[PDB]
């Protein structure tokens, strides 16, 4: 016999590929009688043709390795194979840093912790460097305000 058409039709009906669908070799004449998708559906429901659930692709190992990376492993020079820039652009780092410094100064000026003139000079100093992060900027602000009230 030749159940090629039947395998094709069963795949097209169930909505999978032919690599999945399964024909019990005992009901060969009953399958060969079928030449229609309605008959193939009958054979699907009665239990003559089934679906063959998916071949697995587990991610336990990937999740474990990722967890170790979060914990700070597998990162040394023997694992690094691209440049520091290709791994993380200095442009991206500088963008983050400068957005942060601009946002902080905006919030301080709007709250009233600082005036617009000191805001203006700090804006351009943070556009340049000499403010490496939030901590340094806050400390410089404190020094400025303290010497101002001292004057």
């Amino acid at each position: 016999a030749n159940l090629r058409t039947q395998k094709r039709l069963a795949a097209s009906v169930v909505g999978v590929g032919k690599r999945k669908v399964w024909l019990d070799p005992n009901e060969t004449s009953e399958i060969a009688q079928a030449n229609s998708r309605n008959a193939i559906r009958k054979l699907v429901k009665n239990g003559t043709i089934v679906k063959k659930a998916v071949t697995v692709h587990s991610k336990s190992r990937t999740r474990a390795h990722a967890q170790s990376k979060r914990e700070g492993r597998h990162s040394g020079y023997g694992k690094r194979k691209g440049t520091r820039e290709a791994r993380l652009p200095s442009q991206v780092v500088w963008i983050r840093r400068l957005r942060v410094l601009r946002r902080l100064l905006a919030k301080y000026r709007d709250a009233g912790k600082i005036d617009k003139h000191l805001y203006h000079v700090l804006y351009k100093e943070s556009k340049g460097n000499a403010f490496k992060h939030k901590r340094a900027l806050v400390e410089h602000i404190i020094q400025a305000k303290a010497d101002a009230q001292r004057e």
Binding site: G47, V50, K52, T55
Partner: protein, 50 residues
């Protein structure tokens, strides 16, 4: 017997290829479960009726 179970499941599984068929859809004989449950130590007088 534990080693025998492992050796049996090694042949039975073949899991990295083709995703073992579900038992929902398959059908088994009667006589097979007779032997299985007799080996387990049950009796089939309640199943023979059926």
């Amino acid at each position: 017997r534990q080693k025998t179970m492992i050796a049996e499941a090694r042949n039975r599984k073949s899991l990295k290829n083709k995703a073992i068929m579900p038992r929902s859809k398959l059908t088994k004989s009667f006589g097979k479960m007779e032997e299985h449950m007799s080996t387990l130590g049950h009796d089939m007088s309640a199943l023979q009726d059926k």
